[PDB]
Amino acid sequence: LRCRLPGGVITTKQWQAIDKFAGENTIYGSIRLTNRQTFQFHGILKKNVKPVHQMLHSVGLDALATNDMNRNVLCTSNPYESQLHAEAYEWAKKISEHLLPTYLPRKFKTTVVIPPQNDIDLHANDMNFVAIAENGKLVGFNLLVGGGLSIEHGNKKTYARTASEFGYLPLEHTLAVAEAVVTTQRDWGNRTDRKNAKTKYTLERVGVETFKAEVERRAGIKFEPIRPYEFTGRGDRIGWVKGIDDNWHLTLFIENGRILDYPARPLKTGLLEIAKIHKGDFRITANQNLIIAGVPESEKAKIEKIAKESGLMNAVTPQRENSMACVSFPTCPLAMAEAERFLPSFIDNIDNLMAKHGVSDEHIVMRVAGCPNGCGRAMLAEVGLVGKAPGRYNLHLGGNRIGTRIPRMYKENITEPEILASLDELIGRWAKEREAGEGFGDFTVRAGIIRPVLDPARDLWD
Numbered sequence: 001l002r003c004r005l006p007g008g009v010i011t012t013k014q015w016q017a018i019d020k021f022a023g024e025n026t027i028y029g030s031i032r033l034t035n036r037q038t039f040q041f042h043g044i045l046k047k048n049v050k051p052v053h054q055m056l057h058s059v060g061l062d063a064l065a066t067n068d069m070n071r072n073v074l075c076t077s078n079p080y081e082s083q084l085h086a087e088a089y090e091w092a093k094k095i096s097e098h099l100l101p102t103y104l105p106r107k108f109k110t111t112v113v114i115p116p117q118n119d120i121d122l123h124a125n126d127m128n129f130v131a132i133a134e135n136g137k138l139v140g141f142n143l144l145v146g147g148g149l150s151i152e153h154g155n156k157k158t159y160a161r162t163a164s165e166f167g168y169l170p171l172e173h174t175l176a177v178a179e180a181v182v183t184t185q186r187d188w189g190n191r192t193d194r195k196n197a198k199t200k201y202t203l204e205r206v207g208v209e210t211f212k213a214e215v216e217r218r219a220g221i222k223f224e225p226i227r228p229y230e231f232t233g234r235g236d237r238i239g240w241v242k243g244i245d246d247n248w249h250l251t252l253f254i255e256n257g258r259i260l261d262y263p264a265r266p267l268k269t270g271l272l273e274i275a276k277i278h279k280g281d282f283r284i285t286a287n288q289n290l291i292i293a294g295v296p297e298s299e300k301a302k303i304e305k306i307a308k309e310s311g312l313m314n315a316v317t318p319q320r321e322n323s324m325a326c327v328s329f330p331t332c333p334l335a336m337a338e339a340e341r342f343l344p345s346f347i348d349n350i351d352n353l354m355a356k357h358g359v360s361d362e363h364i365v366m367r368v369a370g371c372p373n374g375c376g377r378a379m380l381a382e383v384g385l386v387g388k389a390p391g392r393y394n395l396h397l398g399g400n401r402i403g404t405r406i407p408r409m410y411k412e413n414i415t416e417p418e419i420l421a422s423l424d425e426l427i428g429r430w431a432k433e434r435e436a437g438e439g440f441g442d443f444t445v446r447a448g449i450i451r452p453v454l455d456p457a458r459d460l461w462d
């Protein structure tokens with residue numbers, strides 16, 4: 001089961017309660033951070049179905065209704081301009097409440113984004129509010145609509161799509177624009193085929209300008225031109241970063257977001273002990289990591305000692321920090337190939353390739369989905385693996401670091417040794433032929449290794 005938790009923000013009181021439930025009332029005993037900034041339990045003792053909704057209520061949390069088609073609303077967790085988080089989080093939470101129960105055809109995903117960071121992967125979402133600020137205060141949002149990554153193997157009527165720019169709106173019209181987008185999707189969405197009901201398909205059927213025009217009419221606003229924004233990356237800021245005031249944020253890399261006491265690495269007990277002394281709250285990131293947020297400088301050495309000792313600060317390569325996998329087996333009923341349990345050893349092999357070609361300090365945004373529903377967001381990666389059968393994946397290449405391009409399929413239905421043999425060849429070509437600061441995804445496009453995806457509804461499929 002899964003929780004509503006806008007922006008990933010969770011208090012220490014809430015953390016201790018979900019930690020107790022996980023340890024005592026689930027089969028796996030783990031807390032799993034998701035890439036939509038919330039958490040999951042796995043294998044709830046069906047003896048404890050009622051107790052989980054009361055445990056959650058006991059600390060001020062609610063679970064979504066699965067008939068309810070909205071999902072968790074994301075918000076940039078660790079903005080470089082640290083003062084912007086409070087206003088942005090406030091709006092993510094406002095949008096979240098405003099869309100709580102208008103029955104939708106398909107599920108609906110929303111984000112609040114703070115440039116230059118695209119950690120929340122806006123182009124995977126139906127509705128995106130890109131924050132624009134003046135003098136350290138929010139003034140409004142650029143609206144991008146119509147992203148979604150789910151596809152069906154072999155079905156060229158399905159496709160991943162990035163999101164389309166509509167225009168800028170002042171802060172005052174946010175809730176109105178949000179509802180206008182939702183109801184327009186609700187009314188114009190396909191009533192015959194579930195598989196065609198997503199906003200990306202509606203937008204392609206009626207045209208972007210037709211959809212934008214209806215949203216303007218319903219919201220009683222006109223869109224201003226887009227105000228300038230640029231993204232520089234999608235990773236988390238692992239380690240200490242200086243927040244506002246004398247506060248500090250410690251971002252901890254958690255492999256697969258899986259929080260459990262392991263031999264010599266008591267990740268779950270360490271976070272408990274941190275929770276009990278930490279003066280602030282936690283932030284779950286869209287990269288399945290955890291921020292100890294708002295640590296006063298005086299408290300840094302105490303927090304870091306616990307995290308150090310528990311294994312929560314074991315150093316990993318930049319590659320491993322920028323790699324992700326969905327849950328997949330053993331718990332997902334839709335899974336086709338391993339993802340979570342495949343990734344650690346697969347990145348071991350990638351680490352070796354990266355060292356052998358002398359690029360062990362750089363990274364390739366690399367992701368694995370266990371099936372083409374796309375939960376791992378493989379369809380926005382530089383290198384994406386999409387599960388097809390046990391041990392077999394479609395290999396996609398040619399996304400970019402900032403997640404604004406769909407990678408085209410490169411090789412179909414191949415095994416891990418075959419994937420590694422191909423990546424070895426390509427990483428070597430990249431190591432020697434790349435220009436200054438050129439990403440691997442961009443390189444495969446430039447070197448003619450793969451043709452880019454320019455208009456996915458039309459040219460994703462060869």
Ligand code: SRM
Nearest residue numbers: 034035036038124148149150325326327331332373374375
């Ligand atoms: C946990 C998570 C992956 C992760 O490793 O973090 C996940 C796990 C599952 N997703 Fe998801 N999805 C997760 C992010 C996503 C995202 C990525 C995102 O939202 O940023 C996508 C792709 C973007 C998109 O929606 O287009 C995604 C698209 C889906 C879909 C396909 C939806 C569609 O439009 O066709 C399904 C299957 C379905 O809905 O029928 C799905 C279904 C599932 C289910 C519930 C499988 C099922 O229907 O029984 C998975 C449960 C596995 C398990 O045992 O835990 N999940 N799923 C993410 C939890 C997020 C959350 O808290 O709400």
Ligand code: SF4
Nearest residue numbers: 326332335370371375
């Ligand atoms: S992508 Fe497929 S396998 Fe991976 S979690 Fe989502 S549904 Fe399960």
Ligand SMILES: [K+]
Nearest residue numbers: 254257287288
């Ligand atoms: K992670």
